[PDB]
Design a protein around this nucleic acid. Sequence first.
DNA 1: GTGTAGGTCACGTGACCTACAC
DNA 2: GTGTAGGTCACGTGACCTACAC
Lengths: 86, 86
Amino acid sequence: ADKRAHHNALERKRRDHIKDSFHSLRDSVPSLQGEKASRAQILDKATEYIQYMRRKNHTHQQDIDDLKRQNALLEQQVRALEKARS
Amino acid sequence: ADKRAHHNALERKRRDHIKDSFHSLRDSVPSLQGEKASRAQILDKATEYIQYMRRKNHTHQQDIDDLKRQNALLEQQVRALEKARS
DNA sequence: GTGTAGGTCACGTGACCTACAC
DNA sequence: GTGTAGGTCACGTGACCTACAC
């Protein structure tokens, strides 16, 4: 009775499922130059990438928001500008 | 001669190195609610996360830039405003 | 509950790629 | 080059968690 077979084979479809869905992670990142590097570092590098996107982003959106208040002072500026012009 | 030993043990430090550096990937992402889920999906989910950060970001920074040209028209507006005031 | 089955891990190994020596 | 060693994978298994039935 294949009880090794369908098993030894089940684990080979699971494992493939990673080796394929693994490069999906790596190539899903720049700083690996589409080549080699441990499947221990595809974790490393990208694990930093989250620090980066949270890092770089959070600020950056807030800086859209300081562009907001920036345009608030602008508001005041407009509130002054004229009382009858355009 | 431990030739199994230092080996069977070498592979156990490597493997740990993943199980630890693996959650470093998972927890390095929201949408997993700090709990369980295949070490095949920690790849899945986060693999999308790159699509997202490139996605959401690229645009968003460009929209800082349409805020740029937005403030360009503003420039013209200023170029009109007054020729002697403040 | 006692089946029969799928997914999910972690272990113990057997290749192969290096590259340091000497 | 022929050593002796480390890292890196992928395979073949042996547990355990379920949860569908019946």
